[PDB]
Amino acid sequence: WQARGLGTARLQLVEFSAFVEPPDAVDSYQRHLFVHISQPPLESVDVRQIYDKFPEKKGGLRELYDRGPPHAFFLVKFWADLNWSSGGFYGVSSQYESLEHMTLTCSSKVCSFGKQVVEKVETERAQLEDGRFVYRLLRSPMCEYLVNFLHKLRQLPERYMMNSVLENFTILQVVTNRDTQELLLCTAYVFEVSTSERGAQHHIYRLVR
Amino acid sequence: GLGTARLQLVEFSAFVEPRHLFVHISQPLESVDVRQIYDKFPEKKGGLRELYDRGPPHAFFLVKFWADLNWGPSSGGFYGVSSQYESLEHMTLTCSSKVCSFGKQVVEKVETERAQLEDGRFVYRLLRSPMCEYLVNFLHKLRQLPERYMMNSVLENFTILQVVTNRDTQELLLCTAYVFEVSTSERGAQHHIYRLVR
Ligand SMILES: CCOC(=O)c1cn(CCCCN)nc1-c1ccc(Cl)c(Cl)c1
Numbered sequence A: 001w002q003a004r005g006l007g008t009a010r011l012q013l014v015e016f017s018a019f020v021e022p023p024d025a026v027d028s029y030q031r032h033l034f035v036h037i038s039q040p041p042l043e044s045v046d047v048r049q050i051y052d053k054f055p056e057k058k059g060g061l062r063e064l065y066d067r068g069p070p071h072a073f074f075l076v077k078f079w080a081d082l083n084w085s086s087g088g089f090y091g092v093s094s095q096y097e098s099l100e101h102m103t104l105t106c107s108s109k110v111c112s113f114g115k116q117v118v119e120k121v122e123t124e125r126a127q128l129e130d131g132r133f134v135y136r137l138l139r140s141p142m143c144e145y146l147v148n149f150l151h152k153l154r155q156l157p158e159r160y161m162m163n164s165v166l167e168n169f170t171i172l173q174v175v176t177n178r179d180t181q182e183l184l185l186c187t188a189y190v191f192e193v194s195t196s197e198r199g200a201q202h203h204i205y206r207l208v209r
Numbered sequence B: 001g002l003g004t005a006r007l008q009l010v011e012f013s014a015f016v017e018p019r020h021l022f023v024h025i026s027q028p029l030e031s032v033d034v035r036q037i038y039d040k041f042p043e044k045k046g047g048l049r050e051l052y053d054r055g056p057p058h059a060f061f062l063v064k065f066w067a068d069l070n071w072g073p074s075s076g077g078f079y080g081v082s083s084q085y086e087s088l089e090h091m092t093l094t095c096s097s098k099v100c101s102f103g104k105q106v107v108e109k110v111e112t113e114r115a116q117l118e119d120g121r122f123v124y125r126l127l128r129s130p131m132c133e134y135l136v137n138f139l140h141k142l143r144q145l146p147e148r149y150m151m152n153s154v155l156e157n158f159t160i161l162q163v164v165t166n167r168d169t170q171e172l173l174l175c176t177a178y179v180f181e182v183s184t185s186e187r188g189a190q191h192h193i194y195r196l197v198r
C-alpha cells in the first residue's frame, strides 16, 4: 500500500536537518534550525508539475522517475527559518534506517532555475543496532556556496523577495544502493521562508504520475 | 611516479562501456609552481592553497591529461571511474574528488576504501564507481563540438582535485590536481605527471 512518512519498506528517513551553531556555542550551546524533519496516507502531487524545477537529462526527475521505483519518490515543501553576523558552523545531518545491510550513496543536487549548480555525493555503510541498520551522515559541513546564499537571502529587505528568489531554488536528493545501483529514495525539496516568529515547518507529499 | 612512500597510485581510468578509455594511468618528475594553479581550484576551505599550507608538500601532484573523446560508430552506455592505490601499511582511505568549473566546486564525491591484503601488500580498489551525472552530460555535450580547439577552450575552465587521506588519522596521503585537453584519437590518450612545489 501507500506511504505514511518519508520512506519505503527498504529505507526510511529518520531525521534530516540543516543548522548553524554560533561561534559561542562552545560556551553556551545552541543551534538554529533552518529546516528540520524528524520521523493516514500522505497527500500526493503530480511529478510532471515540478520537472522544470530540476535538471532534465541524466539524473533529472523525469529520467529518475522512469527508472523507478515510483513509490520511492517524495516532495518536501519547507518553510525555512532564516532569522538567526557570521563565522559559525553550518551543517547538515541525515539519518536513515533499513532492515537490510547496504552501503548507500547519497547525492544532494542544489539547483538554480532547474540547473544543477552544486552537488555532494557521500557513501555510508550500515551500522547494526537494535534489530535494524542505521546510516548516519551527521554534521556534514554545508557547502560554502549554500552558506553564502543563505547570508544573502537573509539580508533581502522583504519576505516576498526571499520567496521570489526561493521560487527558483531547489534540492534533489537521491539515495541508492551503492552495490546494486537501485534507487532507494528520491526527495525533491522546494522552499519558502517562514514568517520570523514561526520557526521551520514542512509538508511531505508522495510524488505520483 | 604518482605516489609517496605511504601510498602509490597503481591505476586510474575513466571510461565508457556499451570499453573506451577517456584517460588512463597505468603504473624524476618535473616540478610546477602550485601558485600557478591556485586560480584553477576554489580559494575556500578545501582550497589548494590551504591544503598545501598544511602539507606535507611531497604529497601534492599535478596530472595533465590529453583525453580521447572519440568513441561511437552514440547514447547510453556505462560511464565509470576505476582507481587503484597501494601501500605497505594497513589503512582505510577517504577519497575526495572535487569537480571544478571556473575554479568553483560544482561536484564533491566522497568514497571510502579499506585495505585488502594481496601479494604481500595492501591494495585499495575503487573500481567502476559510476561517473556522476554532471560529468556524463558535460561529456555528451563536449563531444558534439566540431573542433578540438573548441573542446580545449571549454576544458581550460574544467578541473578536478582529488584528496586522499588516512581516514583514521585525518592525514593527507595524496592530493592530485588534474587539468585537461583533448587528443586526436590518432595520437591517443596521454598524461604527464608533475610535482607541485612552493
Ligand atoms: C555565487 C554567485 O551566484 C551564483 O553563482 C549564481 C548565479 N545563479 C543564477 C542561476 C543560473 C544557473 N547557472 N544562481 C547562483 C547560485 C544560487 C544558489 C547557489 Cl547555492 C549557488 Cl552555488 C549559486
Ligand SMILES: CCCCCCCCCCCCCC(=O)O
Residues within 6 Å of the ligand: A121, B014, B022, B023, B067, B081, B097, B098, B099, B107, B109, B130, B131, B132, B133, B135, B160, B180
Ligand atoms: C575530459 C574528461 C575526461 C573524463 C574525466 C574523468 C575524471 C573524473 C574523475 C572522477 C571524479 C568524479 C566522478 C563522479 O563523481 O562522477
Ligand SMILES: *C(=O)CCCCCCCCCCCCC
Residues within 6 Å of the ligand: A018, A034, A035, A080, A092, A108, A110, A118, A119, A120, A141, A142, A143, A146, A171, A191
Ligand atoms: C553542500 O554540501 C550540499 C549540501 C546538501 C544538503 C543541503 C540541505 C540544505 C537545507 C535547506 C537550506 C535552506 C534554504 C532556504
